[PDB]
Amino acid sequence: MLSKRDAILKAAVEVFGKKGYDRATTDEIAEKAGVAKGLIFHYFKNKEELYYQAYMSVTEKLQKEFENFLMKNRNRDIFDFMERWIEKKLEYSASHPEEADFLITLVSVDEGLRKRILLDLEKSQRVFFDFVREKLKDLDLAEDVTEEIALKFLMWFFSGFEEVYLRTYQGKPELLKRDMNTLVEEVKVMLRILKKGMTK
Amino acid sequence: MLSKRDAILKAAVEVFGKKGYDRATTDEIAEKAGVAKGLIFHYFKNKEELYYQAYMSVTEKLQKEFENFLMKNRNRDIFDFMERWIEKKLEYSASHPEEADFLITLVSVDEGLRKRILLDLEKSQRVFFDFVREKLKDLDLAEDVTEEIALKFLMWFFSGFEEVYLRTYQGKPELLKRDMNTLVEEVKVMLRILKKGMTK
Amino acid sequence: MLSKRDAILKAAVEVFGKKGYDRATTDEIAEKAGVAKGLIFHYFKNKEELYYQAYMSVTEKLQKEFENFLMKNRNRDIFDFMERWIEKKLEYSASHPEEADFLITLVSVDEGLRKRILLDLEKSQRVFFDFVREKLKDLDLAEDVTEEIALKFLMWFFSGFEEVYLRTYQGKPELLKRDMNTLVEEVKVMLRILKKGMTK
Amino acid sequence: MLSKRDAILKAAVEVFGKKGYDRATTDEIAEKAGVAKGLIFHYFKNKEELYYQAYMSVTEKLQKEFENFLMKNRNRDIFDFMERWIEKKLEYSASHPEEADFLITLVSVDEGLRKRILLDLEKSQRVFFDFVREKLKDLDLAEDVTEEIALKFLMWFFSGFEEVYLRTYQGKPELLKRDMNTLVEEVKVMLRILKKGMTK
DNA sequence: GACTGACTGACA
DNA sequence: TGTCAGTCAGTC
DNA sequence: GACTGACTGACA
DNA sequence: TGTCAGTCAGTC
Numbered sequence A, B, C, D: 001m002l003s004k005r006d007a008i009l010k011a012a013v014e015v016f017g018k019k020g021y022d023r024a025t026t027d028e029i030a031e032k033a034g035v036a037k038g039l040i041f042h043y044f045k046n047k048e049e050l051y052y053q054a055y056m057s058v059t060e061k062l063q064k065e066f067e068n069f070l071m072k073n074r075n076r077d078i079f080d081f082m083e084r085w086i087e088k089k090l091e092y093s094a095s096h097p098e099e100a101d102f103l104i105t106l107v108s109v110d111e112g113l114r115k116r117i118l119l120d121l122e123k124s125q126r127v128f129f130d131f132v133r134e135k136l137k138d139l140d141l142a143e144d145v146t147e148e149i150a151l152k153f154l155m156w157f158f159s160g161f162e163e164v165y166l167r168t169y170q171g172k173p174e175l176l177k178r179d180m181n182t183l184v185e186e187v188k189v190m191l192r193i194l195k196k197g198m199t200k
Numbered sequence E, G: 001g002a003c004t005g006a007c008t009g010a011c012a
Numbered sequence F, H: 001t002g003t004c005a006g007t008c009a010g011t012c
Helices: A004-019 A026-033 A037-044 A047-073 A078-095 A097-108 A111-137 A147-168 A173-198 B004-019 B026-033 B037-044 B047-073 B078-095 B097-108 B111-137 B147-168 B173-198 C004-019 C026-033 C037-044 C047-073 C078-095 C097-108 C111-137 C147-168 C173-198 D004-019 D026-033 D037-044 D047-073 D078-095 D097-108 D111-137 D147-168 D173-198
Strands: none
Touching: A004 A026, A004 A037, A004 A047, A004 A097, A026 A037, A026 A047, A037 A047, A047 A078, A047 A097, A047 A111, A078 A097, A078 A111, A078 A147, A078 A173, A097 A111, A097 A147, A097 B097, A111 A147, A147 A173, A147 B147, A147 B173, A173 B147, A173 B173, B004 B026, B004 B037, B004 B047, B004 B097, B026 B037, B026 B047, B037 B047, B047 B078, B047 B097, B047 B111, B078 B097, B078 B111, B078 B147, B078 B173, B097 B111, B097 B147, B111 B147, B147 B173, C004 C026, C004 C037, C004 C047, C004 C097, C026 C037, C026 C047, C037 C047, C047 C078, C047 C097, C047 C111, C078 C097, C078 C111, C078 C147, C078 C173, C097 C111, C097 C147, C097 D097, C111 C147, C147 C173, C147 D147, C147 D173, C173 D147, C173 D173, D004 D026, D004 D037, D004 D047, D004 D097, D026 D037, D026 D047, D037 D047, D047 D078, D047 D097, D047 D111, D078 D097, D078 D111, D078 D147, D078 D173, D097 D111, D097 D147, D111 D147, D147 D173
């Protein structure tokens, strides 16, 4: 059994997941969590904060998972790295599709809340972000390919693929599990393509 | 002067642009178009249809512009093509930022309307989409790089760059016009990178 | 029959009158005015504005009445003036006890709204206010009695008596009508007392 | 250190002081007193009783202070008396502005509680009240100035000045301390004015 | 037709 | 205490 | 007793 | 989508 608070957060994820911020009611969350609607504003003051706390909760978890990954893989080659990492992200998207579907909702929410969160992210991001800067020094670039330019490309790809598939396979984890294996290939090739394009 | 109907559509774009579907009221559109709120449901029956009509209007325009581009360039090499196209798209995004900002709202709207529109798109898309399929037969691929795989990559890139910058430079057209010229280079490199990666 | 809008304002006066700002519900106003609750926020955006509009409405009226009084009495001696004016104010308080009871509510409402209104008043007040400054030049003061000092005294008395009685005889117009006559005397004496105290 | 109970009462004063009855939450009082919200209804059963207990506490204090003043001054002439008293009251209002600001909230509260308290007051008041009745037999009145009439005037003035300034210099103790000395003169004049007006 | 905007009801 | 898409009665 | 604070329900 | 006075189960 989860503490009422924890069960709110969780229902909030399911609910925001299925409808996104605006379309999602607080009372559905209260029904789904089996709690008094008021309790929600006990813990979270208002809906905006609630979404926020929910999103932090979830990212807390991934960050944890990522940080552990990184250690166990600091040593890998960069692409080899991304290759493997992307794998795990899909494995998560399939083992926790509600969380996945919920993180995607971030764009639906007002300038204010959104920018707030994004900033809280750049912090967490800067780790991985900076690590990549280093593992590129390790590569023999073409004489027209900035490390700056390279980073943008990879960081776009990396997180862009995330949103690219993730809306396409939204509410269809079944269909993802099916297709996972191909995707992983397509990726491996895509990265392989970039490596060949950036190196001498 | 625009017909009252045409001025609704237009205000609807500005409005949906700045708030996205749900947060955007019909009565703001009626204030901003200077019309009776009832008029809106004269012309468009309901808000969903309204967003829809607005989105079609706008895409009618781009498709027209694109189709003309394609003729004047059907002959070019594929990357050379995208290179130059991306250029025009930014030029438009800067000359018509409201339209830009509105097209991006598509993700905020319910399964129903969204899917509808996306389908109406694949239609429009299929032209360019299919043209690319052809200009790739013209290329000497690596022995592990399906035409299928290639197309995904490019089509992702192509429209993914759109969303990548467009949120980053949202409400900052000044800052875009400044940076436009770099971007175009960054792109040319990126495409160059891909060409080198896919070919023998 | 009153326009729905006008009937809201009116019920709002009754209601605020009986409970004051905070304790008073909007839906009671809607019941009492026989209207959709939403219509209220059609016309007045929110409750604060509503109270405000109600208070302006009412003061509009008194100001009108006062301005007419003043003309018909510019010529009187100052006390003779206040004497008579006070009479009329009670005559109003008795002929329109709801309005009376409502104006008193002003103190119950948050710093914001309150200060706003009070300022809108000093404007209207400054007329009477300034007129009094003049009708004192007409008086032979004691050699220790500033016109400044005198004004404060009278302006305090004048409006202070208002609140002094008005809360005491709140919701008791019956009891006021009874007592009106004495009060008018007590006043006449009180003013008479001040005149004797300020003059040589 | 104050007993948790005593610290509730005190925070209740600050809180009711700044927002008045209805706008003031019990949980703010609990935050500001650093206590469990339930504790409040341990000690005071409900919010109405709480305000009440708070108000009595405070008036216990003033009455005590006043009763001591009266002894040390029972002998003085009546105006001389009020003159000097008013002085002390300001001194208190400046040394304890929260208490001041809280006593003024009395009008914001429902018929019931209010009337209750007011009655408990007439009791406390009757002392000073009755003393004044006596010190007026000592005065040679005008042949149209009832002792009754006189008392009203003075009792109004006396406590009316309190409310007159106190709202004007609300949340501005700095500005009061500045002006204190003038006020005291303005008063002395005012009283002087009344003495001259009531006597032969 | 186009056009209005006061008005509602069910919902946060 | 707000919030909004949609309707409705009716003018032009 | 004192003390807590998560929790509710009816209400804006 | 908030708002709040009051309760309730239970520790110390």
